[PDB]
Write a structure and sequence with these properties.
Order of helices and strands: EEEHHEEEHEHEHHHHEHEH
Structural class: alpha/beta
Largest sheet: 8 strands, mixed
Helix content: 25-40%
Family: Belongs to the mycobacterial A85 antigen family.
Shape: globular
Pfam families: Esterase (PF00756)
Number of domains: 1
CATH class: Alpha Beta
Keywords: Acyltransferase, Disulfide bond, Secreted, Signal, Transferase
Organism: Mycobacterium tuberculosis (strain ATCC 25177 / H37Ra)
Strand content: 15-25%
CATH topology: Rossmann fold
Main location: secreted
Strand order of the largest sheet: 1-2-4-3-7-8-9-10
C-alpha cells in the first residue's frame, strides 16, 4: 500500500556529528540484511529523495530486506570531512562515513535487530561513488554496492574541480572542507576507480548504472539532466574497462542507449535490482 506500511521515522543520535540524524526505516524482519539507500547531492533534511520520488518502501515490503534511508547531508558525499561542513545556511559536522559504518548499524542492530553486516549500499549522483567507497573500505559491512549515475573518477583531471562546483551549487559548501585541496590524498582515497583493486579483492557485488543522456517516454527530458548524465557516463565506461582489466567479476554494468539524470530512471533501477539484492544478500 503506499499508506499503511511499517515505515518509521527514526532519530538516530550521532556522537561524531553532535546531533540526531533522521533515518527513514522499514524492517525486513529480525536479522534481515540492510539496504542503505543513499541520497543524491541535494539531499534534503526532512525526507530522503528515494522516499520522495519512488515507492521504494512499497516495492521492498516483505522482500526480506530492511530499507534504511539516512536523511540529510547535502553535498557530503557520505564522507568524513576534514573540517566543518559550512554552507549557505550555516555550519554542520559531516562525519558520515563514521555514522554509516559504526553509529547507525550499531543502533539499528541494538534497537531494530537489523543485521549489521552483509549490507548493500546504493546511491545515486554524489552517492554512487560513496557506495563503492563504503564497500571498498568496509567490505564486511557492505558486500554489495549500487552506483547510479555517479562520477566514478572524482580524483582525476577536472573532477576535483567539478565536484567543487556541484557542492557550491548545492548548499554553498566547499570541497576543500571535505577532502582538502585536490593534492590531498583524500581525493584518491575516495575515488572508486582508484579503489578497484579493493573492490575486486573483496569480490564486492557491483550494480553500476548510467544512462546516455537521451530521455525516452519515461521523462526527464530537460537539458541539465541530459548534460549531466552524458557527462558522468565516460567515467562509468572507464570504470567498467578498468574493473574488467583488474580481474573484476561480480558486477552488473547497465549502460543503456537511454536515460537522463532524473528519478524516473533511478527508481526504475532500484525496482529492477530487488531480486539481485535478495539473492546477493540472502533475503527470502
Amino acid at each position: 500500500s503506499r499508506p499503511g506500511l511499517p515505515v518509521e521515522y527514526l532519530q538516530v543520535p550521532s556522537p561524531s556529528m553532535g546531533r540526531d540524524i533522521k533515518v527513514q526505516f522499514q524492517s525486513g524482519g529480525n536479522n534481515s540484511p540492510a539496504v542503505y539507500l543513499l541520497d543524491g547531492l541535494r539531499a534534503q533534511d526532512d525526507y530522503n529523495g528515494w522516499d520522495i520520488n519512488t515507492p521504494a518502501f512499497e516495492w521492498y515490503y516483505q522482500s526480506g530486506l530492511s530499507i534504511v534511508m539516512p536523511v540529510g547531508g547535502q553535498s557530503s558525499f557520505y564522507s568524513d570531512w576534514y573540517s566543518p561542513a559550512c554552507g549557505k545556511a550555516g555550519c554542520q559536522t559531516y562525519k558520515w562515513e563514521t555514522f554509516l559504518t559504526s553509529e547507525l548499524p550499531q543502533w539499528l542492530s541494538a534497537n531494530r535487530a537489523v543485521k549489521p553486516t552483509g549490507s548493500a549500499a546504493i546511491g545515486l549522483s554524489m552517492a554512487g561513488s560513496s557506495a563503492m567507497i563504503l564497500a571498498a573500505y568496509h567490505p564486511q559491512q557492505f558486500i554489495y554496492a549500487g552506483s547510479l549515475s555517479a562520477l566514478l573518477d572524482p580524483s582525476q583531471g577536472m573532477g576535483p574541480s567539478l565536484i567543487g562546483l556541484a557542492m557550491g551549487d548545492a548548499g554553498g559548501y566547499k570541497a576543500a572542507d571535505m577532502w582538502g585541496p585536490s593534492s590531498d590524498p583524500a581525493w584518491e582515497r575516495n575515488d572508486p576507480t582508484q579503489q578497484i583493486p579493493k573492490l575486486v579483492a573483496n569480490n564486492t557485488r557491483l550494480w553500476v548504472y548510467c544512462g546516455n543522456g537521451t530521455p525516452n517516454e519515461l521523462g526527464g527530458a530537460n537539458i541539465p539532466a541530459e548534460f549531466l548524465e552524458n557527462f558522468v557516463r565516460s567515467s562509468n565506461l572507464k570504470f567498467q574497462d578498468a574493473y574488467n582489466a583488474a580481474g573484476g567479476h561480480n558486477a552488473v554494468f547497465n549502460f543503456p542507449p537511454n536515460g537522463t539524470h532524473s528519478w524516473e530512471y533511478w527508481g526504475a533501477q532500484l525496482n529492477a535490482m530487488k531480486g539481485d539484492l535478495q539473492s546477493s544478500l540472502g533475503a527470502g
